[PDB]
Amino acid sequence: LRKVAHLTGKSSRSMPLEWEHELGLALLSGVKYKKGGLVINETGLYFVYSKVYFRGQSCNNLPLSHKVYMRNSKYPQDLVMMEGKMMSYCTTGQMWARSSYLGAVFNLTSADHLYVNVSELSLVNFEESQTFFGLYKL
Amino acid sequence: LRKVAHLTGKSSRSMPLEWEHELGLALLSGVKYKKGGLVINETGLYFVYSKVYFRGQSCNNLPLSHKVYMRNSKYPQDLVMMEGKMMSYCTTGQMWARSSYLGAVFNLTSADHLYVNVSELSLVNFEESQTFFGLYKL
Amino acid sequence: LRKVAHLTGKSSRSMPLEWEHELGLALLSGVKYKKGGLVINETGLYFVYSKVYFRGQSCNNLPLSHKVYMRNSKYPQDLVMMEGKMMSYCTTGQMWARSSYLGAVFNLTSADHLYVNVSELSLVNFEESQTFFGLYKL
Amino acid sequence: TPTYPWRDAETGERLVCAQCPPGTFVQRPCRRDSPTTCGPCPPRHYTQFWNYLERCRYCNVLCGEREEEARACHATHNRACRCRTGFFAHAGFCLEHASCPPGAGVIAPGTPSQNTQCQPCPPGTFSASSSSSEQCQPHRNCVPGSSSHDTLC
Amino acid sequence: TPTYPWRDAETGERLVCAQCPPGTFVQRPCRRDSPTTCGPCPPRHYTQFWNYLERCRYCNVLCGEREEEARACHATHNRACRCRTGFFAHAGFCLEHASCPPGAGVIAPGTPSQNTQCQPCPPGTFSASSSSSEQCQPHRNCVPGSSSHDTLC
Amino acid sequence: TPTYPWRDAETGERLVCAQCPPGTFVQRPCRRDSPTTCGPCPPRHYTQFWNYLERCRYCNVLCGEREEEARACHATHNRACRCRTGFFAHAGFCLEHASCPPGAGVIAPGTPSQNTQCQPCPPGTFSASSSSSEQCQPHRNCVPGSSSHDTLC
Ligand code: NA
Ligand code: NA
Ligand code: NA
């Protein structure tokens, strides 16, 4: 059975983000979710992706950052896999909305924990069709 | 033979959008197109994606919305799978252009009809390399 | 062994762009890199993707273009597969940053050379987690 | 009672099954020897119409920090939200109601669906305040009262 | 006639094949006992150069609401577009030609590739109008005529 | 010396292995009959802490056109960058130091981490220049000197 995940937005105040993994459009099959992270359990090639939807009443061009990263035990430090940054993206003062999409292929090892992370947690909107984090084994 | 589709932009005034499915960069293999929709015919996991390219002579920050959604007979109501919204994305008065990219994994059933849909059909540009809608079975 | 590539940004002044293909997050397996291009060596279906990250100190809304295209011997002219354009994307005068994401499925033949290409090479930022170009065989 | 077609995945045989009602979903399809069996939507789920789903829909509307539940999640309907007191819906956001500045007063307060509505205080009346509720009041009957300031004694 | 190399997918054997011309594409590659066979581009397709394609290119340029066909789709070339009358190309858009306001006149109209060009009406001449075509005219020979208004009698 | 657990991929058997130090990576894990074997980070690679990696990290920081190497890539650390002379870091960019205009002078120059700092030249002093370094100087002791212009004789 194909190793796969589609996690969707969830309400908490933590970095990294935490995700819904059962209800609605969520999927999780042969891969684990633990404290915000997807936990690889078969070394291999995977396509990994995340979208996050930002929005606010009053544009002030706070820098927006969107990161997929990896950790394990083997070394005591986050490794960033994909990242977007947005600056000067709304007209100051206006209601605004924009999304960041990341998707790419990675060779990953068993025991790798993958996480998504973000600059302005207040700016994030957590609707399930708008903000998500997934992968599948090739 | 891998179940697959890559649909490309086409000129009509309808919501949902309608797509080219034979000519040029289009592909359609083991999956059907009917009245704007891709019609799943094997329950399974699929990666689904759409890009749409918006543009206009004179920015007025009309809200842009880009949606992938599903319908069937089993329940009489659209279900949204992925969505982007853009607000405050161009400098008012200017020529502008931006795109929305959506892509993610879904478990889908036979008889599911998938469609793309959009806020400002006048704003959409339908070049085949710019505006598209696809999936493949995993 | 799965035919796959993930190329990452690299410093040169050339169009098309040129990529890192060994170090760090790069991957290249059963597919060749030659003078900026990925060289298909098994006719088939592939998902192809590129992100590029643009940034500048002083917004002047230069048009940004991001293209994946193909060439071979069989015809003496580039064919564009995916493309984004951005206009009126930063507030004039400000520090800015934005990314273009493209990803889609293509039937490709052996001997096809794929390349990425871009409007404002000075505006591109080449961090490996920010700017990349990849594919995999289905 | 509305119906639905169903090939038996056992005999390939064409049946007409009956749809589960709101609050329920199909739990076993009708076969030759029995009608459809419907089950209750579990928690956090719903079905709102006559349906042939194999699982109930998820109550996927959640309420913003500036919203309250208009309806709640129930086996028969999805949760629904609205702007909390002191806000109005616009372009999918919940905005604070306008205050009318001085020399203006409220001809209509802000509802959940609209802003405050103001007028220039008309002759004979005034408003001292930036208020989202205070309305233009007639001057006192004793310097000439403006629309911003009361008549002085 | 330009050529192209071809391993037989039957014998692996190296051939030199000949390329199909514009308007055609390779329909069967040359083998030992025959030359290349070329076929006609079907409708909505084209090839514009000497080629060894296994299928003709698609005529994938379509004309905007503000454009007309400069060339049409033909077996020998892709369709090509341009700004319709009253517009000029800029940054991939088709923009309306400027009008010159009053006291300005048209020294050059708008082509498909450029805008209207205006000058301040020179002494002795005037323009009454916002016109994308009207040009500065000499005053009448009878109040002093401005560049915006004619000399009055 | 910090350690790490390791099932033998041969016997499934639980070991406690020892970690490779900075500058090295695991090249063969410890088994029953031997300890861990560590190898040197190749060029363009590094490990900076006690680690159990099967390959060294890549020195993936590269320096902008407006930056210089603060540290270099070394087997023990990643390369590190900073704003070159005449620039300061802000929001991930390297910006040119401010000049103070005339009638202003530099109370603190621009470092790699900050801008130029200026004051209104105080009474008795002046600055003639847009200078990122020139500071307010006392007028000459002979028209009254402004903050922009010297006292004149
Ligand atoms: Na509204
Ligand atoms: Na131009
Ligand atoms: Na800073």
PDB file of C-alpha atoms in Angstrom, chain A residues 2 45 47 80-89 101-107 136 138, chain C residues 2 4 6 25 27 47 49 51 53 89-91 94-98 101 129-130 132 136:
ATOM      1  CA  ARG A   2       1.392   3.299  -1.284  1.00  0.00           C
ATOM      2  CA  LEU A  45      12.401   8.827  -3.141  1.00  0.00           C
ATOM      3  CA  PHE A  47       7.648  13.968  -3.786  1.00  0.00           C
ATOM      4  CA  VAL A  80      15.826  23.082   4.857  1.00  0.00           C
ATOM      5  CA  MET A  81      14.517  21.405   1.766  1.00  0.00           C
ATOM      6  CA  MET A  82      12.263  24.070   0.174  1.00  0.00           C
ATOM      7  CA  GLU A  83      11.476  27.612   1.053  1.00  0.00           C
ATOM      8  CA  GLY A  84       9.575  30.593  -0.198  1.00  0.00           C
ATOM      9  CA  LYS A  85       9.755  34.196   0.987  1.00  0.00           C
ATOM     10  CA  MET A  86       7.394  37.024   0.015  1.00  0.00           C
ATOM     11  CA  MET A  87       8.111  40.736   0.509  1.00  0.00           C
ATOM     12  CA  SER A  88       6.199  43.744  -0.869  1.00  0.00           C
ATOM     13  CA  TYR A  89       3.237  41.624  -1.811  1.00  0.00           C
ATOM     14  CA  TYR A 101       3.374  26.639  -3.026  1.00  0.00           C
ATOM     15  CA  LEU A 102       6.315  24.339  -2.666  1.00  0.00           C
ATOM     16  CA  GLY A 103       6.708  20.925  -4.209  1.00  0.00           C
ATOM     17  CA  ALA A 104       9.711  18.793  -5.127  1.00  0.00           C
ATOM     18  CA  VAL A 105      11.465  15.398  -5.034  1.00  0.00           C
ATOM     19  CA  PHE A 106      13.727  14.186  -2.305  1.00  0.00           C
ATOM     20  CA  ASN A 107      15.635  11.097  -1.388  1.00  0.00           C
ATOM     21  CA  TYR A 136       4.104  10.297  -1.478  1.00  0.00           C
ATOM     22  CA  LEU A 138       7.589   7.218  -5.756  1.00  0.00           C
TER      23      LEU A 138
ATOM     24  CA  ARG C   2      13.594   5.375 -10.901  1.00  0.00           C
ATOM     25  CA  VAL C   4      14.717  11.232 -11.500  1.00  0.00           C
ATOM     26  CA  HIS C   6      16.267  17.491  -8.733  1.00  0.00           C
ATOM     27  CA  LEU C  25      20.002  18.504  -2.302  1.00  0.00           C
ATOM     28  CA  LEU C  27      19.778  14.322  -7.469  1.00  0.00           C
ATOM     29  CA  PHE C  47       6.118  15.053 -14.012  1.00  0.00           C
ATOM     30  CA  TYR C  49       8.663  21.069 -12.061  1.00  0.00           C
ATOM     31  CA  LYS C  51      10.498  26.928  -8.760  1.00  0.00           C
ATOM     32  CA  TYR C  53      12.826  32.773  -6.432  1.00  0.00           C
ATOM     33  CA  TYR C  89       4.010  42.432  -8.169  1.00  0.00           C
ATOM     34  CA  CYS C  90       5.839  44.763  -5.804  1.00  0.00           C
ATOM     35  CA  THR C  91       5.268  48.221  -4.494  1.00  0.00           C
ATOM     36  CA  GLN C  94      10.518  48.567  -1.948  1.00  0.00           C
ATOM     37  CA  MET C  95      12.625  45.467  -1.175  1.00  0.00           C
ATOM     38  CA  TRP C  96      10.742  42.613  -2.656  1.00  0.00           C
ATOM     39  CA  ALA C  97      10.716  38.842  -3.090  1.00  0.00           C
ATOM     40  CA  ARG C  98       8.409  36.417  -4.870  1.00  0.00           C
ATOM     41  CA  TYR C 101       6.136  27.591  -9.303  1.00  0.00           C
ATOM     42  CA  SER C 129      16.025  25.460  -1.257  1.00  0.00           C
ATOM     43  CA  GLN C 130      14.640  28.403  -3.210  1.00  0.00           C
ATOM     44  CA  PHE C 132      15.205  24.381  -8.504  1.00  0.00           C
ATOM     45  CA  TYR C 136      10.595  12.087 -12.424  1.00  0.00           C
TER      46      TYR C 136
END
